Symmetry: D2
Subunit: 260 residues, 4 copies
Amino acid sequence: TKLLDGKVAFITGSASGIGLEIAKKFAQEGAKVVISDMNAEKCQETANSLKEQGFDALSAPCDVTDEDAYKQAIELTQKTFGTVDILINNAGFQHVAPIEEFPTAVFQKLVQVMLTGAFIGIKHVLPIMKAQKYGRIINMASINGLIGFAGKAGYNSAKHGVIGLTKVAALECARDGITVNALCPGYVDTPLVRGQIADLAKTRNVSLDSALEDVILAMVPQKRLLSVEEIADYAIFLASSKAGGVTGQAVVMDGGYTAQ
Amino acid sequence: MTKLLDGKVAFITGSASGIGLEIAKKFAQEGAKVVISDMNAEKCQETANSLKEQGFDALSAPCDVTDEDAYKQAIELTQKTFGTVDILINNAGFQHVAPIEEFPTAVFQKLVQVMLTGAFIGIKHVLPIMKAQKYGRIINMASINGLIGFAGKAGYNSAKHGVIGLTKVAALECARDGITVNALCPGYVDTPLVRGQIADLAKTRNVSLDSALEDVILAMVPQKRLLSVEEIADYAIFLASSKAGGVTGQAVVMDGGYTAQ
Amino acid sequence: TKLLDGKVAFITGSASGIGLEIAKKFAQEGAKVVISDMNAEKCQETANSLKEQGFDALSAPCDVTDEDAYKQAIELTQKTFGTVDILINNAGFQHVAPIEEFPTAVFQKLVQVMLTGAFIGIKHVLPIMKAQKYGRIINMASINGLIGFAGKAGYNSAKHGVIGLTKVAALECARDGITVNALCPGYVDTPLVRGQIADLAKTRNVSLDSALEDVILAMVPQKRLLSVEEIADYAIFLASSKAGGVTGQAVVMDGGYTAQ
Amino acid sequence: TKLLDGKVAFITGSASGIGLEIAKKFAQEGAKVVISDMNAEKCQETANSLKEQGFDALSAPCDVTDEDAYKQAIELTQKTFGTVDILINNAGFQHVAPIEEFPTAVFQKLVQVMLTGAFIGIKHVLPIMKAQKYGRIINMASINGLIGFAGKAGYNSAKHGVIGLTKVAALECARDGITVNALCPGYVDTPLVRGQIADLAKTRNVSLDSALEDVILAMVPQKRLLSVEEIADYAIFLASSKAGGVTGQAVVMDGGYTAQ
Ligand SMILES: NC(=O)c1ccc[n+]([C@@H]2O[C@H](COP(=O)([O-])OP(=O)(O)OC[C@H]3O[C@@H](n4cnc5c(N)ncnc54)[C@H](O)[C@@H]3O)[C@@H](O)[C@H]2O)c1
Ligand SMILES: NC(=O)c1ccc[n+]([C@@H]2O[C@H](COP(=O)([O-])OP(=O)(O)OC[C@H]3O[C@@H](n4cnc5c(N)ncnc54)[C@H](O)[C@@H]3O)[C@@H](O)[C@H]2O)c1
Ligand SMILES: NC(=O)c1ccc[n+]([C@@H]2O[C@H](COP(=O)([O-])OP(=O)(O)OC[C@H]3O[C@@H](n4cnc5c(N)ncnc54)[C@H](O)[C@@H]3O)[C@@H](O)[C@H]2O)c1
Ligand SMILES: NC(=O)c1ccc[n+]([C@@H]2O[C@H](COP(=O)([O-])OP(=O)(O)OC[C@H]3O[C@@H](n4cnc5c(N)ncnc54)[C@H](O)[C@@H]3O)[C@@H](O)[C@H]2O)c1
Ligand SMILES: CCC(=O)CC(=O)O
Ligand SMILES: CCC(=O)CC(=O)O
Ligand SMILES: CCC(=O)CC(=O)O
Ligand SMILES: CCC(=O)CC(=O)O
Ligand SMILES: CCC(=O)CC(=O)O
């Protein structure tokens, strides 16, 4: 079964972690994938690997805060694969700090990448998806789009914001056969989080396994990291023709974090 | 093709009609062994037998979900027949629309007993089976009416709100036991229940059936369409599958954008 | 100085805890209060102490699960004070158990008192409030109306349901000068909770302080019990003429619990 | 009774609409109020009116996007009234358009004023409020912080974001006697909205009453505009010492909008 057979998916931040797994899993589902990241070296390598494995893949690097570059990356996608069926707004980063020590510029950058970048993508894929009366837009958000976490003023503001953007975008294209959803993971086993576990274990002087099980997963009822494979499986369902009635939703995959 | 529920036993309450019946047929196509449980023991036997004629593993285990003794025995019959319960779908329900002042208390209590207490009884009697095997999928068929209000639906919206409360408690109690508990929340599905309500509104208002649907039911639906039972079954398959082990405690919404505005 | 002057407040479960405080504080704001509880002797002495302080108080005991007694308690209020302006559906109780050890009858009872009780109160005051084009209904819920907690299947199901009833009721009287809101406290310093701290302290062989600071309040960002007066102050605001634009809301007072 | 006696309130955008009402109502409840807006003559005019009526008021204009100006306005307040007890992040604007014809720079501007402006305000009052272990921060949001509305990508993104910032901020100061809440009105009777009724009546060739009652209020159960007075009354309660237990909340007054 090829759930995304020949569907054209553009995935921002797809050179690492969740975005890279989505791209691999989408290709295996039969999607034509576009690897898009800051790092144009890792983009070209990723797309070349996929091509060598017999997949349709394109390197179209861009900074999602660079509207002109994001625009041309979509136009390159149209020229290569004819259309865009699926946009995954996945590009992001993290800066943890008390509000008092939280540089305004860093706050503005978290918002620009993870909110304005999503808005820029939606703005330039909407005409393609409305012309063909089909589309799937997934904004990679977080449970931090639904609840608060101390030290994450910029991240939680950006992810809250992309849930509002998701709902506005959904309402504007609900008649055009296009869905816009925010996939909200909890803690995922990624380089980023393995970094934070690394950080916690030195800064608290506990083991890597104690940093994970006693602090990172203390408020996770399943007491486990989500796999990138699980996130990509939900993304595949929402991006499929079978999820046409799901739109305007903060779709939560969090091992019960927000249930308590 | 693939069998997303291969090797799993699915007990589905209210599975002799509408959404329950589509879930049972689609779960079977995904390689689940399905138990058709409903009030109408006649339609259950016929449903299960028709599935069996199409090469599927189906059991007729009729019960009234408000009858804890009959529910417990329907679960026991499933264990005896298939060995275990992997997936419980709490889907049995009904509707009674009236202003609160003309809403009989007993009808309010019955709506709550069937759609809330019924889901509680099901959960209490599958939990030990699922916990001993460290695997389970519990889906409560709630509604967007579990998350928002609608005038005249005091009993329904009260039961469906409550079943989302019960989903969260259950999810927290079995989070470490490889069991998920979710509330699948449809908006308007093209079913007998809903086609009945369109006829009602069209009589009482003396508009045409298309007028009642398009001007009243679908006014609030951004997608301006009824969902298909197939769409609900497809979400139910994903949540009931091994692929969704990290989804729990959730009101999972498929509503054509209804709660987005 | 008198935010409820000339208003008639019917308060279920007002013989103890939050309901008792709401009755006393509502009287101070110039409301005529009906003390209604299971224990008729405590309703009489409460109403009498209030009367000795120059307040207008009526004893109207009932079991809120007894629609005939509830209906007769409302009728007696109409007979004595001319109308019901404010209904406080406050009557409740708690039973904590794993779902496996949770008796179905106890589950049903929790739902009958805290959901059905509320439906019965609302059904019998709505015609009175709709006739005068003025009402304030407050369903005393809990953050357990909004999130899950292990061992509270019955209570969390009842409280979730009363938020559902609250939004339905609100929509049905929105044009009639009536509001219907669910006040949702976190942990409040009441006999009920002081009981639960004493319980936890024996069960875990810890101080009363440790049971409170380290178990009860570990999920409360403010790390404190709410006072019954704080709950009463929010109840007075929502029950006052100044809150006519608040309806259909789960109004949360929880020292930040639901923010995490 | 003066509910904010001896409190200093800093209100951004207080030269007009909800902010102006909050300043005049906070003054009547005994707050020293700071009038801060873009319009510097209107702030001096407003503050002078309150002074003539026996009220403590200070003009301290600033663009909330100008962190250096906002920091100096908070400093001027410290110099004049000793401290800041209450911050009302109120400054906002609106721009309605489909995503495709929604200028990226306008989207950025809505977020910069209504999310980043609040971040800057919170960042510079938190050390003052933490030092004295007392504070009240109210971010004026909107039901558009909780649901989607077609054509308001920028506004709904910004309001969604400010609720995220509210929950983060609440968690960072929950132990410090500081509450952070987002007050979320539906349609309020303001120059802003009357403007919008004027536009709908003209661009749809219908009466002002047609355009309000049949279009703007179509999704409002109470079928009425809220008053600036109603918003101010909830703002006063939230900002009072009586609301110490309310924090990290999206506090909704929407005549039932979000109940359906
Ligand atoms: N990993 C988690 O635990 C977790 C939790 C919840 C949700 N998410 C969200 O999912 C997304 C994936 O994060 P991840 O874990 O894969 O992190 P990661 O660090 O592995 O990958 C992030 C990628 O984003 C790229 N990027 C950053 N800014 C960019 C920009 N302006 N334009 C283009 N590319 C840019 C980086 O180059 C990098 O390759 C993020 O938005 C994150 O907030 C992650
Ligand atoms: N149809 C929709 O648009 C829609 C939308 C949202 C929610 N739902 C929910 O999805 C579920 C399925 O709805 P539906 O319209 O297919 O059917 P329904 O709600 O009318 O009930 C379906 C089945 O439940 C059975 N049933 C009723 N009471 C029972 C009892 N006490 N014990 C056992 N079985 C009993 C009936 O015999 C029927 O076959 C229900 O919970 C409903 O509330 C439906
Ligand atoms: N205590 C808390 O921390 C807390 C937190 C969240 C919500 N609540 C809710 O607020 C309300 C008040 O709680 P409390 O702590 O003051 O409770 P409490 O147990 O101290 O007092 C409740 C009163 O209700 C009465 N009552 C019980 N069943 C009744 C019935 N069927 N009919 C009439 N009266 C009945 C009892 O006799 C008692 O006087 C309850 O609904 C409770 O669930 C309390
Ligand atoms: N109007 C409504 O019904 C409604 C409903 C929901 C929310 N709100 C919110 O309430 C608040 C007040 O709205 P209003 O109706 O009083 O509008 P208004 O236009 O009368 O008030 C807005 C004020 O903010 C000022 N302002 C704009 N940008 C600024 C900046 N960068 N720095 C400083 N001041 C700036 C303007 O000069 C103006 O005085 C806004 O945040 C708005 O989003 C309004
Ligand atoms: C959303 C949880 C998370 O992973 C935020 C972050 O640390 O990037
Ligand atoms: C949730 C839609 C529905 O099924 C309510 C009803 O029965 O009218
Ligand atoms: C003993 C529990 C309770 O107080 C319920 C009732 O009054 O019927
Ligand atoms: C916080 C809800 C509640 O009241 C649980 C309890 O009974 O202590
Ligand atoms: C309804 C919230 C609001 O005030 C947005 C607008 O219409 O300006």
